Structures are given as structure tokens and as C-alpha cells.
Enzyme design. Structure first.
Site, PDB file in Angstrom:
ATOM      1  CG  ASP A  15      -0.535   0.098   2.429  1.00  0.00           C
ATOM      2  OD1 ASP A  15       0.617   0.233   2.771  1.00  0.00           O
ATOM      3  OD2 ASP A  15      -1.216  -0.598   3.367  1.00  0.00           O
ATOM      4  NE  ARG A  29      -0.893   2.979   4.484  1.00  0.00           N
ATOM      5  CZ  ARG A  29      -2.116   2.484   4.504  1.00  0.00           C
ATOM      6  NH1 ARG A  29      -2.840   2.522   3.329  1.00  0.00           N
ATOM      7  NH2 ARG A  29      -2.683   1.786   5.509  1.00  0.00           N
ATOM      8  CG  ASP A  34      -3.772  -1.929   6.851  1.00  0.00           C
ATOM      9  OD1 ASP A  34      -2.685  -1.353   6.590  1.00  0.00           O
ATOM     10  OD2 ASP A  34      -3.850  -2.451   7.964  1.00  0.00           O
ATOM     11  CB  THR A  35      -1.505  -4.095   1.888  1.00  0.00           C
ATOM     12  OG1 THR A  35      -0.552  -3.197   2.258  1.00  0.00           O
ATOM     13  CG2 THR A  35      -2.121  -4.019   0.490  1.00  0.00           C
ATOM     14  CD  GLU A  37       3.408  -2.800   7.567  1.00  0.00           C
ATOM     15  OE1 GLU A  37       2.133  -1.968   7.693  1.00  0.00           O
ATOM     16  OE2 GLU A  37       4.150  -2.417   7.178  1.00  0.00           O
TER      17      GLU A  37
HETATM   18  C1  THP Z   1      -4.286   5.604   5.007  1.00  0.00           C
HETATM   19  C2  THP Z   1      -3.931   6.644   6.185  1.00  0.00           C
HETATM   20  C3  THP Z   1      -2.983   6.459   7.215  1.00  0.00           C
HETATM   21  N1  THP Z   1      -2.673   7.243   7.829  1.00  0.00           N
HETATM   22  C4  THP Z   1      -1.767   7.157   9.136  1.00  0.00           C
HETATM   23  C5  THP Z   1      -2.751   6.438  10.142  1.00  0.00           C
HETATM   24  C6  THP Z   1      -1.689   5.324  11.013  1.00  0.00           C
HETATM   25  O1  THP Z   1      -0.982   6.074  11.895  1.00  0.00           O
HETATM   26  P1  THP Z   1      -0.072   5.203  12.928  1.00  0.00           P
HETATM   27  O2  THP Z   1       1.210   4.928  12.241  1.00  0.00           O
HETATM   28  O3  THP Z   1      -0.023   6.257  14.113  1.00  0.00           O
HETATM   29  O4  THP Z   1      -0.551   3.944  13.038  1.00  0.00           O
HETATM   30  C7  THP Z   1      -0.647   5.171   9.684  1.00  0.00           C
HETATM   31  C8  THP Z   1      -1.110   3.761   8.959  1.00  0.00           C
HETATM   32  O5  THP Z   1      -0.132   3.729   7.757  1.00  0.00           O
HETATM   33  P2  THP Z   1       0.114   2.151   7.632  1.00  0.00           P
HETATM   34  O6  THP Z   1      -0.780   1.173   7.487  1.00  0.00           O
HETATM   35  O7  THP Z   1       0.990   2.586   6.202  1.00  0.00           O
HETATM   36  O8  THP Z   1       1.168   1.717   8.924  1.00  0.00           O
HETATM   37  O9  THP Z   1      -0.900   6.056   8.761  1.00  0.00           O
HETATM   38  C9  THP Z   1      -3.348   8.617   7.789  1.00  0.00           C
HETATM   39  O10 THP Z   1      -3.094   9.363   8.712  1.00  0.00           O
HETATM   40  N2  THP Z   1      -4.074   8.911   6.916  1.00  0.00           N
HETATM   41  C10 THP Z   1      -4.670   7.994   6.067  1.00  0.00           C
HETATM   42  O11 THP Z   1      -5.371   8.143   5.219  1.00  0.00           O
HETATM   43 CA    CA Z   2      -0.171  -1.505   5.873  1.00  0.00          CA
END
Ligand code: THP
Ligand code: CA
EC number: 3.1.31.1
Length: 129
Positions: A15, A29, A34-35, A37
Site C-alpha cells: 500500500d 500511501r 490496509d495491506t 506488512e
Molecule cells: C491510510 C492513512 C493512514 N494514515 C496514518 C494512520 C496510521 O497512523 P499510525 O502510524 O500512528 O498507526 C498510519 C497507518 O499507515 P500504515 O498502514 O502505512 O502503517 O498512517 C493517515 O493518517 N491517513 C490515511 O489516510
Molecule cells: Ca499497511
């Protein structure tokens, strides 16, 4: 919403990827998904699916939604198209991503993606197996 040009710099994982957008390198992103990891179950499969999709594409496009365009880590938040097919939707339809991170006002394609997830789930595909 509208589609804008970008070119692939490098695949990263299911993702996220590195694209050139307005002539600048950025990590993107994918909105509303959510894919797993890479180190998790289906993570390598998701990574490979996204990589193939974007590397094989003649035309990459980014479509921002109505709200926030960058997250707190400085990643671009977009729907990403490969030769007109949405990567976000395609991952969900194959059971390689869950609909997730649906924040108010960047959720234009929420219902489209939830329809894809329902189909992947009915088919018991991948994550839903
Ligand atoms: C997809 C997305 C993720 N995020 C933030 C939320 C999560 O914060 P946290 O890192 O604090 O968990 C993180 C998840 O991305 P990843 O799934 O790439 O880890 O990215 C956003 O703020 N907006 C979005 O639209
Ligand atoms: Ca992810």
C-alpha cells in the site's frame, strides 16, 4: 476528483510506493485500504501484486480526495491508477487489502471499495480464506 500524472520511482510494499509527482519524489500511501506488512501473512503477496500492477503500467495517475493530501509522515494520500485501473480497488477485490482508515472527507471511493471487499469475502480470497 481528478487524475493527475505521476511516474513510478520504486515499488515499496502493498500500500505504499515511491512516485514522482509534479517533478518531486514522494512516498504515497493508498487511501482507504490496509495491506498486511511484508512480515505478515499475505504481506509478500500484496507487495508483489502492487509492484506488478504499477511496474507493468504504461501510465500511472494519482487522484487526491477532497481532504488531507499528505499524512503525518509526509506521505501523499491518494487513489493510484495503473492504465486506468485503481490499485486501491484491485487490492481489495483480490482479498489482499482490507478497507480501512476511512476518515471523514477523504472517503470518496468508500462505497466502491466496500463493494469490492464484499465480493472478495464472498469468494473467500486470500485474507478472507
Ligand atoms: C491510510 C492513512 C493512514 N494514515 C496514518 C494512520 C496510521 O497512523 P499510525 O502510524 O500512528 O498507526 C498510519 C497507518 O499507515 P500504515 O498502514 O502505512 O502503517 O498512517 C493517515 O493518517 N491517513 C490515511 O489516510
Ligand atoms: Ca499497511
Amino acid at each position: 476528483l481528478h487524475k493527475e500524472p505521476a511516474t513510478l520511482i520504486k515499488a515499496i510494499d502493498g500500500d505504499t510506493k515511491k512516485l514522482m509527482y509534479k517533478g518531486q519524489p514522494m512516498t504515497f500511501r493508498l487511501l482507504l485500504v490496509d495491506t498486511p506488512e511484508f512480515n505478515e501473512k499475505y504481506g509478500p503477496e500484496a507487495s508483489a501484486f502492487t509492484k506488478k500492477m504499477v511496474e507493468n503500467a504504461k501510465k500511472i495517475e494519482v487522484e487526491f480526495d477532497k481532504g488531507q493530501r499528505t499524512d503525518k509522515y509526509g506521505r501523499g494520500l491518494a487513489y493510484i491508477y495503473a492504465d486506468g485501473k485503481m490499485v486501491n480497488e484491485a487490492l481489495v477485490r483480490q482479498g489482499l487489502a482490507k478497507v480501512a482508515y476511512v476518515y471523514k472527507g477523504n472517503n470518496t471511493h468508500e462505497q466502491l471499495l466496500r463493494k469490492a471487499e464484499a465480493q472478495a469475502k464472498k469468494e473467500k480470497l486470500n485474507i478472507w480464506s
